[PDB]
Design brief:
heterotetramer; A mainly beta (614); B mainly beta (362); C mainly beta (233); D alpha+beta (693); B: mainly beta; Immunoglobulin-like; OB fold (Dihydrolipoamide Acetyltransferase, E2P); five-stranded antiparallel β-sheet; 43% strand; C: 233 residues; mainly beta; S-adenosyl-L-methionine-dependent methyltransferases; 2 domains; binds a molecule of 2 linked components (NAG-NAG); binds 2-acetamido-2-deoxy-beta-D-glucopyranose; binds potassium ion; binds magnesium ion; Cobra venom factor alpha chain (chain A); Peptidase_S1_PA (chain D); EC 3.4.21.47 (chain D); Complement factor B (chain D); serine-type endopeptidase activity (chain D)
Chain lengths: 614, 362, 233, 693
């Protein structure tokens, strides 16, 4: 009686896409045909299979579809996913993406001299591809289809444009891409490195404190540098740097160490008007010369935010909708001004008399009890750090809105995860909680749930519900497949007519999904020495290697590949746009990155773009 | 749509280069390179448009840009072989240059006088980094003086003694650099040396081609008798290209070099130059070697040398005098009657006779 | 005399900014915990520095893994450190400032020599290397200036060698000096618009670019012409 | 003459030559005299001072270890291992970075002539207009761009000399101008095999043919340094070489016109291309046999330029003759490169290139019309100078320096042998594996592996202890295993002869002949090896038809330590192993190690198990010898002489089974074929081998 089709709200070409087809209130076995056609003309059948839906399977099927990029090329593209069978005809138009997976470029260095080869690899998270080089002026100078097994070095000419070059890797027809950068400069490697340590990671916009940078200068072979440093402070306003000329200071570097100081008085004389500072950063340019004058290194301490508080409160990890008469889980996210998580910070919502202290991931979950009658929910949170005056505490407000029930039924679903700092290997209790009409609720026999990861449906399941149980608990085993995060979407249906849905966004500890370690003896070596290292990793791993002079990083360290860049890039591409729940049943699917259609014509609205709004 | 056929014909190769430019590859710039400067013929057929840029790179005839700098070094008396180093500098901008640096390297084997350096390091406007002292010498071969500023209106001068730490065969020039915090771009450097007005190593340039002239001087060979077999062997080393008897016609000067103009009187051993007697030969030396070479106009010389020492002088034969060059005074015809030169003359005649008649021995 | 024989001093010369750009396959049998190891042998290059070995792996089910950097620290107790300028100009005298490091906790007497290279005018000659001898205190450094005039355009080795009296310690360094022609590098820029429809005959456009007018040019210096074609959108 | 005070060399010896006006240092194998090998007597009664290449004076001569050049750089790849210096027999291997492809030899071995085996390893991404020229080991390259008209320059570490091209330019045709450079040290030299192959391959096109224009012509100019520096012995050796070269050239059926010039202070022209007889090989050969070293005794300087001007004068014309632009010119120059009169000879080369219009028209460079080959002769060769005169052509060699004159002669002996039929005994042309040992036979007998040598179309010689339809024999490295007809054991053989004396195996007369059922077909991989006291071996050693058996024995097996070799199979690969036969003062101690062999513990006097039939190798004196494996038993013990391979023994038994850290008593024993000649002569009487006695 109720037939439903759920897909990702965006489908990728050339990759396994699970979809979910269900029959509720129907225990008759069926052969279902699954089609995918190009939209709107349906010129061709992009994909086709057939599935068996039977009682033994909960009258639920999860066919995998796959859309070949080569069948649907040429310039937003859509496809229509169609399910047909006895008494069954569902159809859904879905946005297509040409980004079949996530690509990442590794180059051998971040900086090159004229007349030298740029060596690069392209990695894909799931194993074709176009690679392009552009000059600093933005001119395309190389364009090649590459096999992900063999890459062609780009040989820089001797008469070559200086500045920041780009390598771009993309699937053909994809407006998305991965861009990496490298500098081309006339440089020689310095013989030593300069490390900078600010007195604080921030600078109070209206504070009284001075600011210091401690300088450590060490030769790359490990010994201390003696010399002199010239330090100039300034404020970076967007792109332009406005220096504080009277802050220019010359200080001795003795036994590798020195300390430069910006006096508050000097700062104020130059920047008396607080308005000019809001949103901007302090920087310190540090130029170190060895005592003999044989060598010099120029680096900069940047990104010292000029702020009124050491913390920031964010609500980006908490749902903007609540269920009246059910406890609302408020996830508070506190960061430092640079956006790293702030651990061990007390927070409080005074109006609710709720307190918590953030964990290593910077989050604290507070439970707010919500009266049955509330339709709007103003919330204000502030830090409550014992060492700060109230004026330095960070604060932030939001308003959550009540989930609108289908037809005013008053039926709700709330999925609760109490666990924190979740890591692969963990066993996570998931609570299904229902609220509403007694006669409606007795009709509930099961919850359907989907685990969404990196834009896909990763797993679908059924959770039984014995009548009487307004609380039903399930164990979820966390595997490396759920890194860097996942969504838990769930719903029940009543009377083959009403769908009630919820979802939660669950962060997972970011690590490699597998394992890779380089082990050595850690002894100091002589030039030309015989080395042995062990590479430890997963069976069948293909390992790309490189050895880089640490001196290279002294000149440039901004562009290197890393795991955090990998996970961050993936998160920025999430098809779901919110931290959970929704304005109504359809809102829950849409906001989580799912499309829904039903035999009763309950349909999620068309999605604008693959990219979640700013 | 866009559909361009491009043909490039270069003289440096028979097979022209051909591109098609269409919508699909329009963004891609195509480059061709030639090391010549010759006519280029380009053809374009079809629908689209393109921009062709021809870049010709070359070196054109054209540092101490933002500072003036004078350096001199002098002898002084200490009662030692002490020297006095003097440095004057001024900034060429419109205000004083902040955080200026005077960067000094010592002559080989010299170190700063410790008392003078300490005297210099005083003042609320300067800084000189830490140095140990031994035997009244600051243990720094490179000495940096940091100034809070240098004047743009008037020269700022300083001086200090440098003392001999150790001896060497030859003393390399020292140098002084000046730059400042906001002008670390500045290439401003002068050399100094107790025996050279400008601290420059001796070289000899013909246009843009320079040769190292050596810091050591060659000297006229003198021998009261010639061991003829031995002399023959020396003349017959594979690196000895020619052996001549010459007369010195003139001594000319230019760019601190002596040009000894030689007429080749006799080819004793024929070298690479096929007709040396036809053209006059310039033998070039630094004036530092004047005294030691002690050549006299109208005197005759035995000269042999290496082909390596030929200079790229157009329309004259010129050699650099080097340690491979053998020069010896050849007594005049009338001198051959004095008992002073009698037997030496016999030796020269026998040397000449053996070589011209029989050649080298091996 | 009390010093290491020159021929017994093998100069360091291999100073790459990056190397070991290779790929290995974890072909070996997983241990009890699913982990397969691979022992890998190689030799270090010549730099006295810290190397960072970076590994990035991929397996079909585990996606991409970037490993933590592994540092290799390289050192000698006595060595030459030679910072070279990016380039120098032909015929212009310049000073090269080597640093000698004594990381031995005792006073030493050393010999340092600059090798002869016909491409330079220096204190060294074909017959005689420029040699100095001087003390260095325990655990200290000493600047050792060398004055040279580059006589030839291109890349030419500077080589310095040093040893300690009545001890085994020695080091040599050979590094490339980049020598550019005199004068200044200029570019003559000629822009030609290809547009056969508007400029051609029968849809064909023929352009002849004549040899460029130069010869304010330094004699015998190289010339390079780049012909760049860019289609218009 | 010169006093011998303080001439001695640490670690070696010296020998005076040319009656005391020159001395030669002698160093143990694996070593070389530093800084020079030969000194000359000065006028002052003092020996020429010891000078390094940098012309830096050395105070003491000493025998130093041979090392192959260290890599100074290797682009787009890694090599293993990295050492301060590389010892003889050391191996180095190369590996490319990702995205680059390896050309040349991935694995290279350091050889006793100071050279690395194989071809330069290059890691190339094939992006250039031209390929990546590479970095021969020991050189440094400047220039990493490989576009049309780009150049790269090479240099060697001062102390060594650059052979080949110091600069190479990428040409329109896709190749690099000039020829690949290498680094030459004082002790380095070309093997005679390498030179024969390089020269003949350069001169001909491949059987082989000399190539000329349609209706074409060829001029060969033989130019021989007869100055004082050369010496009478090398001069006469150089003559013989030229005589043999004339024969070789004649085999190709072309009729070159010859020029024949010897020179010292002045050139003496013996044959001019303009003479009627100049294309007459027997005439030219006759004149060549006329030349006397005394002819330049009086005026004995070295004016190489003037010699070359005599070649130029033979090429020049009074307008140019019909078909002048059609003739191909080959200059064969033999000199020590120590010219001392007339200046730089290279200027004549340029004049000749001008005359022949070579390298003037880029549309027709005409480089094919001139080849200059230079062979270093004399006691002291100046490499830079001989290289300067020699043609520089891509993938060809035009300049050669061998160890000594005997080796130079071997070059030309091998060339003459190259033409002849396959039945020519003990002859190998070094172009596989059986290509390198075509005499080698594998013998398999099946019972509920030995080696042998082919000695004729019917016969394979092996060891008798290998035996007792069972016996299969394979050659040429073929799956095909041949049927035998009968095995003839030496009649005096008896392995159980001394059984009752407590000696279980007695190896005396341990030789057997296998007669095949069918005749062998000789080919690239199947050839016979020379036997002692035959016509073939008299001819292999270049001796007269009057040479006696005793004279062969004195030549092949002197009472000394004798360099020899055997062939071992290591992993389906044949490989040559260098050993020393202890036939002199070490013979006794080599033999006595027999009493440590298994089974021989009861032996009281080693003459009971080591007889006069045995030759002995192995052990550590004079050098550490490799040992035979069980598989190698029955195989040939070979002496390599005048470019030929002569079997002197059959591998019989060893003291220690070492199939390293091998013990000093590990000797191998072989049956001396000179000791079983009557059986050999008798059994092989009908094989056309031509035995003496
Ligand atoms: C060639 O032989 C020498 C030994 O004469 C090897 O010497 C190495 O380097 C020095 C000795 O000069 C030692 O400190 C090393 O320990 C030696 N090698 C070892 C044992 O690791 C030299 O390595 C050899 N070259 C090779 C084998 O490639
Ligand atoms: C530099 O020039 C000034 C003149 O402007 C002169 O007086 C002074 O002596 C010079 N300084 C030196 C050579 O040290
Ligand atoms: C790659 O993606 C971004 C989108 O703005 C940008 O760098 C650029 O437009 C793209 N590059 C391509 C598609 O070549
Ligand atoms: C190089 O040597 C190794 C063994 O050390 C061998 O496995 C490899 O096949 C060799 N490469 C060749 C012979 O090309
Ligand atoms: K700074
Ligand atoms: Mg995470
Ligand atoms: Mg001679």
């Amino acid at each position: 009686a109720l037939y439903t089709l759920i897909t990702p709200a965006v489908l990728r070409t050339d990759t396994e896409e699970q979809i979910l087809v269900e029959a509720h209130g129907d225990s008759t076995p069926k052969q279902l045909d699954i089609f995918v056609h190009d939209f709107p003309r349906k010129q061709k059948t992009l994909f086709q299979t057939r599935v068996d839906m039977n009682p033994a399977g909960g009258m639920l099927v999860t066919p995998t579809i796959e859309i070949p990029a080569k069948e649907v090329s040429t310039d937003n593209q859509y496809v229509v996913v169609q399910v047909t069978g006895p008494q069954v005809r569902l159809e859904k138009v879905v946005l297509l993406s040409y980004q079949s997976s996530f690509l990442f470029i590794q180059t051998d260095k971040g900086i090159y001299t004229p007349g030298s080869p740029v060596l690069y690899r392209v990695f894909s998270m799931d194993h074709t591809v176009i690679v392009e080089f552009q000059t600093p002026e933005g001119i395309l100078v190389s364009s090649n289809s590459v096999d992900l097994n063999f890459f062609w070095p780009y040989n820089l000419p001797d008469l070559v444009s200086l500045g920041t070059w780009r390598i771009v890797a993309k699937y053909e027809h994809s407006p998305e891409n991965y861009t990496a950068y490298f500098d081309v400069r006339k440089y020689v490697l310095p013989s030593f490195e300069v490390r900078l340590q600010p007195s604080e990671k921030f600078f109070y916009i209206d504070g009284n404190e001075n600011f210091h940078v401690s300088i450590t200068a060490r030769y790359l072979y490990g010994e201390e540098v003696e010399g002199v440093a010239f330090v100039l402070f300034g404020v970076k306003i967007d792109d332009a740097k406005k220096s504080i000329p009277d802050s220019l200071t010359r200080i001795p570097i003795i036994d590798g160490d020195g300390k430069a100081t910006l006096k508050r008085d000097t700062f104020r004389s130059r920047f008396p008007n607080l308005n000019e500072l809001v949103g901007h950063t302090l920087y310190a340019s540090v130029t170190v010369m060895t005592e003999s004058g044989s060598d010099m290194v120029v680096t900069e301490q940047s990104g010292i935010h000029i702020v009124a508080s050491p913390y920031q409160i964010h609500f980006t990890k908490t749902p903007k909708y609540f269920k009246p008469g059910m406890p609302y889980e408020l996830t508070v996210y506190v960061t430092n001004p640079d956006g790293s998580p702030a651990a061990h910070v007390p927070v409080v919502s005074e109006a609710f008399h709720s307190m918590g202290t953030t964990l290593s991931d910077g989050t604290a979950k507070l439970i707010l009890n919500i009266p049955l009658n509330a339709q709007s929910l103003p919330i204000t949170v502030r830090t409550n750090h014992g060492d700060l005056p109230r004026e330095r505490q960070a604060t932030k407000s939001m308003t959550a809105i009540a989930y609108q029930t289908q037809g005013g039924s008053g039926n709700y679903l709330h999925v609760a995860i109490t666990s924190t700092e979740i890591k692969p290997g963990d066993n996570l209790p998931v609570n299904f909680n229902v609220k509403g009409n007694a006669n409606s609720l007795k009709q509930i026999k099961y919850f359907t749930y989907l685990i969404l990861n990196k834009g896909k449906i990763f797993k679908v399941g059924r959770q039984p519900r014995r009548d009487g149980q307004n609380l039903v608990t399930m164990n979820l085993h966390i595997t490396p497949d759920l890194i860097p995060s996942f969504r838990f979407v769930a719903y029940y249906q009543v009377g083959n007519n009403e769908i009630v849905a919820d979802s939660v966004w669950v962060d997972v500890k970011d690590t490699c999904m597998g394992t890779l370690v380089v082990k050595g003896d850690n002894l100091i070596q002589m030039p030309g020495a015989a080395m042995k290292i062990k590479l430890e990793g997963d069976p069948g791993a293909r390992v790309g290697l490189v050895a880089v002079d640490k001196a290279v990083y002294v000149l440039n360290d901004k562009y290197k590949i890393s795991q955090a860049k990998i996970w961050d890039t993936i998160e920025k591409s999430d098809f779901g746009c919110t931290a959970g729940s929704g304005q109504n049943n359809l809102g829950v699917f849409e906001d989580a990155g799912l499309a829904l259609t039903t035999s009763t014509n309950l349909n999620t609205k068309q999605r604008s773009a693959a990219k979640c709004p700013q | 749509d866009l559909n361009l056929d491009i043909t490039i014909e270069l003289p440096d190769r028979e097979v022209p280069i051909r591109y098609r430019i269409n919508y699909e590859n329009a963004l891609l710039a195509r480059t061709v390179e030639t090391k010549l400067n010759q006519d280029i013929t380009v053809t374009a057929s079809g629908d689209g448009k393109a921009t062709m840029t021809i870049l010709t790179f070359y070196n054109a005839q054209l540092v101490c840009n933002k500072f003036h700098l004078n350096v001199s070094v002098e002898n002084i008396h200490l009662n030692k072989g002490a020297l006095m180093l003097k440095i004057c500098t001024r900034y060429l901008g419109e205000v004083d240059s902040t955080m200026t640096i005077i960067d000094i390297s010592m002559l080989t084997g010299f170190l700063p006088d410790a008392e003078d350096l300490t005297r210099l390091s005083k003042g609320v406007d300067r800084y000189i980094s830490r140095y140990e002292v031994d035997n009244n010498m600051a243990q720094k071969v490179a000495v940096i003086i940091y100034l809070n500023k240098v004047s743009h209106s008037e020269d700022e001068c300083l001086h200090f003694k440098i003392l001999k730490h150790f001896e060497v065969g030859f003393i390399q020039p020292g140098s002084v650099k000046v730059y400042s915090y906001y002008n670390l771009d500045e290439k401003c450097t002068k050399f100094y040396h107790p025996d050279k007005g400008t601290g420059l190593l001796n070289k000899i340039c013909i246009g843009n081609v320079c040769r190292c002239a050596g810091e050591t001087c060659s000297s006229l060979n003198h021998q009261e008798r010639i061991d003829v077999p031995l002399q023959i062997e020396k003349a017959c080393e594979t690196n000895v290209d020619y052996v001549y008897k010459t007369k010195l016609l003139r001594i000319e000067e230019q760019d601190g070099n002596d040009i000894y103009v030689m007429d080749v009187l006799e080819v004793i051993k024929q070298g690479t130059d096929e007709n040396p007697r036809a053209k006059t030969h310039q033998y070039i030396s630094q004036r530092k070697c004047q005294e030691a070479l002690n050549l006299k106009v109208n005197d005759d010389y035995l000269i042999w040398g290496s082909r390596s020492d030929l200079l790229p002088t157009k329309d004259k034969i010129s050699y650099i005098i080097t340690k491979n060059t053998w020069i010896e005074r050849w007594p005049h015809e009338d001198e051959c009657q004095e008992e002073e030169f009698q037997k030496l003359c016999d030796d020269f005649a026998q040397f000449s006779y053996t070589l011209t008649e029989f050649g080298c021995p091996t | 005399d009390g010093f290491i024989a020159d021929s017994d001093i093998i100069s360091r010369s291999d100073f790459p900014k990056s190397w070991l750009w290779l790929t290995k396959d974890l072909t070996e049998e997983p241990n009890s915990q699913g982990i397969s190891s691979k022992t890998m042998s190689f030799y270090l290059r010549d730099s006295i520095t810290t190397w960072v070995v970076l590994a990035v792996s991929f397996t079909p089910t585990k996606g991409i893994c970037v490993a933590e950097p592994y540092e290799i620290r390289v050192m000698k107790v006595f060595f030459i450190d030679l910072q070279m300028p990016y380039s120098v100009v032909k015929n212009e005298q310049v000073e090269i400032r080597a640093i000698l490091h004594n990381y031995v906790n005792e006073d030493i007497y050393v010999r340092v020599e600059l090798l002869y290279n016909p491409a330079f005018c220096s204190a060294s000659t074909k017959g005689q290397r420029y040699r100095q001898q001087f003390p260095i205190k325990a655990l200290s450094s000493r600047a050792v200036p060398f004055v040279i005039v580059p006589l030839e355009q291109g890349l030419h080795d500077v080589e310095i060698k040093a040893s300690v009296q009545e001890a085994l310690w020695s080091d040599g360094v050979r590094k490339k000096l980049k020598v550019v022609p005199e004068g200044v590098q200029k570019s003559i820029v000629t822009i030609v618009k290809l547009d056969p429809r508007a400029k051609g005959v029968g849809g064909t456009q023929l352009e002849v670019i004549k040899a460029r007018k130069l010869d304010d040019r330094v004699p015998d210096t190289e010339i390079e012409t780049k012909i760049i074609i860019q289609g218009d959108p | 003459s010169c006093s011998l005070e303080g001439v001695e060399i640490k670690g070696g010896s010296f020998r005076l030559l040319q009656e005391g006006q020159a001395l030669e240092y002698v160093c143990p194998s694996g070593f070389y005299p530093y800084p020079v090998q030969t000194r000359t007597c000065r006028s002052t009664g003092s020996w020429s001072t010891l000078k390094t290449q940098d012309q830096k004076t050395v105070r003491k001569a000493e025998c130093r270890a041979i090392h192959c050049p260290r890599p100074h750089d290797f682009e787009n790849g890694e090599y293993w291992p990295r050492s301060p210096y590389y010892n003889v027999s050391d191996e180095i291997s190369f590996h490319c970075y990702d995205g680059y492809t390896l050309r040349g030899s991935a694995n290279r071995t350091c050889q006793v002539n100071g050279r690395w085996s194989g071809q330069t390893a290059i890691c190339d991404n094939g992006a250039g207009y031209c390929s990546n020229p590479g970095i021969p080991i020991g050189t440094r390259k400047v220039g990493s761009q490989y576009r049309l008209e780009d150049s790269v320059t090479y240099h060697c570490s001062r102390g060594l000399t650059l052979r080949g091209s110091q600069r190479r330019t990428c040409q329109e045709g896709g190749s690099w101008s000039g020829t690949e450079p290498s680094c030459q040290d004082s002790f380095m030299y070309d093997t005679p095999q390498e030179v024969a192959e390089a020269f003949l391959s350069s001169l001909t096109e491949t059987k082989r043919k000399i190539v000329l224009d349609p209706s074409g012509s060829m001029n060969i100019y033989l130019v021989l340094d007869g100055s004082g520096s050369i010496g009478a012995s090398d001069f006469t050796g150089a003559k013989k070489c030229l005589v043999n070269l004339i024969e070789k050239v004649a085999s190709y059926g072309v009729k070159p016109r010859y020029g024949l010039v010897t020179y010292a202070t002045y050139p003496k022209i013996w044959v001019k291309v303009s003479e009627a007889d100049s294309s007459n090989a027997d005439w030219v050969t006759k004149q060549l046999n006329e030349i006397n070293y005394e002819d330049h005794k009086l005026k004995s300087g070295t004016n190489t330029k003037k010699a070359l001007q005599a070649v130029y004068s033979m090429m020049s014309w009074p307008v140019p003759p019909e078909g002048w632009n059609r003739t191909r010119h080959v200059i064969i120059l033999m000199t020590d490169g120590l010219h001392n009169m007339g200046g730089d000879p290279i200027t004549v080369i340029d004049e000749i290139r001008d005359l022949l219009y070579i390298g003037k028209d880029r549309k027709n460079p005409r480089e094919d019309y001139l080849d200059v080959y230079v062979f270093g002769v004399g006691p002291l060769v100046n490499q830079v100078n001989i290289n300067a005169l020699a043609s520089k052509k891509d993938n060809e060699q035009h300049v050669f320096k061998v160890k000594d004159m005997e080796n130079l002669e071997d070059v030309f002996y091998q060339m003459i042998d190259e033409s002849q039929s396959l039945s020519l005994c003990g002859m190998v042309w070094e172009h596989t594996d059986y290509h390198k040992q075509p005499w080698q036979a594998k013998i398999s007998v099946i019972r509920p592996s030995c080696m042998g040598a082919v000695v004729s179309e019917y016969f394979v010689l092996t060891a008798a202890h290998c035996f007792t339809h069972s016996i299969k024999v394979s050659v040429g490295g073929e799956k095909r295993d041949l049927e035998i007809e009968v095995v003839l054991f030496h009649p005096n053989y008896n392995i159980n002869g001394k059984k009752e004396a407590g000696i279980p195996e007695f190896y005396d007369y341990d030789v057997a002949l296998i007669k095949l059922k069918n005749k062998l077909k000789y080919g690239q991989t199947i050839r016979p090896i020379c036997l002692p006291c035959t016509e073939g071996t008299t001819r292999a050693l270049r001796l007269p038809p009057t040479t006696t058996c005793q004279q062969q024995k004195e030549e092949l097996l002197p009472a000394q330590d004798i360099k020899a070799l055997f062939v071992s199979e290591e992993e389906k690969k044949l490989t040559r192993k260098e050993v020393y036969i202890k036939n002199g003062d070490k013979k006794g101690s080599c033999e006595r190690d027999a009493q440590y062999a298994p089974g021989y513990d009861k032996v009281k006097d080693i003459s009971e198990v080591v007889t006069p039939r045995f030759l002995c190798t192995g052990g550590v004196s004079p050098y550490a010898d490799p040992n035979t494996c069980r598989g190698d038993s029955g195989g040939p013990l070979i002496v390599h002489k005048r470019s030929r391979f002569i079997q002197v023994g059959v591998i019989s038994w060893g003291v220690v089974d070492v199939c390293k850290q091998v013990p000093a008593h590990a000797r191998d024993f072989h049956i001396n074929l000179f000791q079983v000649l009557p059986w050999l002569k008798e059994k092989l009487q009908d094989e056309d081998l031509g035995f003496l006695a």
